[PDB]
Amino acid sequence: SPMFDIKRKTIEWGGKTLVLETGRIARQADGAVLATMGETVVLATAVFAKSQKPGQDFFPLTVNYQEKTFAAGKIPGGFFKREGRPSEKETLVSRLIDRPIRPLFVKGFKNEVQVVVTVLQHDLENDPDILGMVAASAALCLSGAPFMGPIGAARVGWVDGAYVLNPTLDEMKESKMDLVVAGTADAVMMVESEIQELSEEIVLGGVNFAHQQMQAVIDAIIDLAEHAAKEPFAFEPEDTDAIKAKMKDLVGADIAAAYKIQKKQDRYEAVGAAKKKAIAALGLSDENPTGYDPLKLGAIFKELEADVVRRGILDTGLRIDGRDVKTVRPILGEVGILPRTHGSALFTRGETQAIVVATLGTGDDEQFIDALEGTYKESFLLHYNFPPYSVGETGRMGSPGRREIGHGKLAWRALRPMLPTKEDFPYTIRLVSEITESNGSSSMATVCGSSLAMMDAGVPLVRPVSGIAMGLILEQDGFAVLSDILGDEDHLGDMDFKVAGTSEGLTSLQMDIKIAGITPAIMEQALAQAKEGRAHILGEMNKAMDAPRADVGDFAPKIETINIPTDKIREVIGSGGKVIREIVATTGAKVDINDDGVVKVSASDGAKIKAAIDWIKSITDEAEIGKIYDGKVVKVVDFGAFVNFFGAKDGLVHVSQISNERVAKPSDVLKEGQMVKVKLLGFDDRGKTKLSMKVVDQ
């Protein structure tokens, strides 16, 4: 037969069965699994180069997660009805898949590797991202490429108080958590979450739930691999140690009294020293074979700086900037810098400042997110922008990148929780964050600044939110947890992570680990410190807001909202828009529309909005119900009283159902115009309107 599969079908996985087909499709790739989760179907292919590029200084890895529209029987809404440039989600999973992997390629291995995942069937229940991560993983192990150990991934939800594994789309609708996690047999590797205000324990309890729950899949992948993987590709995990130790003793003291250099001068001076000095003494030579070529001899020094700085930080919590592992940097918040803009903020932290500005709009300003789940409309628009001058370089500009997007997402994931409902606040709020200075987590600095810029704009942010960048140097013996890390501190820590939330729990946690050994004990201690830090950064935010501005700036606009009984829709819309257009033209206000009977009315004037609202209510009113109500007597009669729930449509308070006990002649509360409260007994004979006074009550 063509095709000689092969497939681990076994694995029902927390309610759902997972398939892994190989051998049948894309045999021409090195690995190509076809995973299935119920009905959601994705093909993963990994192909990797067998040479290494000549001038090859980094490991070139690329992941392309892509969704074909037909997987959910559609045809793109594109003018070209073919699908092209990658979506937010396309780009965002691709990152999410890439993250946990990159670390896991054998040290030294610098070959071109490209994993492609493609979504072929979406059952509108199982989100393909998690599946896709698994698939990538599978496909890879199968390839024989030097990719250490299959990697699993699990999304966790929060229902009732149960961590639930891989909540389908529906199950998500009712969860207080979207915590995605991927890891190996040994530790988790990455974590990206979105949290509806939960505490460290509940959240990290999440992580560990996921760790176990993927353990089934990791084992599975192996099962498949066992009789299906390609002959593993022989590559000598490069050993540096030999030459690494040799350069250490030529410079290893010259850096201990080099970094120690407080004055930024020789503090680099010794740098260039080492540089020149060593580059010479051993360096492919000139003469003189041993040691290694002046090429790969960089890396060693780079590496070596690490090993030096890092020791120095475990013995004394003394960092490069000379501060203690716990000590956060100087913050300064600042609101309404550049007024006119619906909400503005210049959050700044040591050397990590963002300008952040909010922008209210209408429903016209919502964004159609033509998704596979279901094309839908987002009204929350974080846009993150990281320009080169923000680090003293040149380049780029426009067309935001994969991180520029992942970060603005990371921040958005850390605010969507603390948002007022379209009920309290019926707007669409943009928020671009322009990093003007980076050196610490601009991604965190953005959120903080937004939390600010948004209150300034006039937003019922149910609480304000902080964030801190975090690090983690880790040796077998001891280890440090760095609060508010530098750009450098990241490029050396064995783990780095951003914690975001309020002072009543977490709004988002993102993590990225590089090495195994982060016991749940080390983790909790970590968020512990983060809790301290972030609720401190929060301290400074309040020193510029603490609560929203009462309202918004008159430019821009309201935006006022109300509900109507659903069965009234036609009457306000009218035949083909007849009434609605008339209402909009006249009052000068924008109206729409929904279907749960929700009306949002907008313009610049409160006058036009009231006009519109009051209009609609006239078409909408009449109910009764009854339902007590207020009103005024219109006329009184030795007979009873006529009064007004408003809308002329009066009612009668029968001379009988007035005040109880005795009334002789209804001159009891006889005052033409005197306001009272009344309940409608019901429009008694004929289309009449009985109604009396138990005010109060039943």
């Binding site: 490429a145 066992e226 009789h227 993987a229």
Partner: peptide, 8 residues
């Protein structure tokens, strides 16, 4: 006989 393996 089992295949292996980088996983391993």
């Amino acid at each position: 006989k089992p295949r292996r393996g980088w996983w391993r």
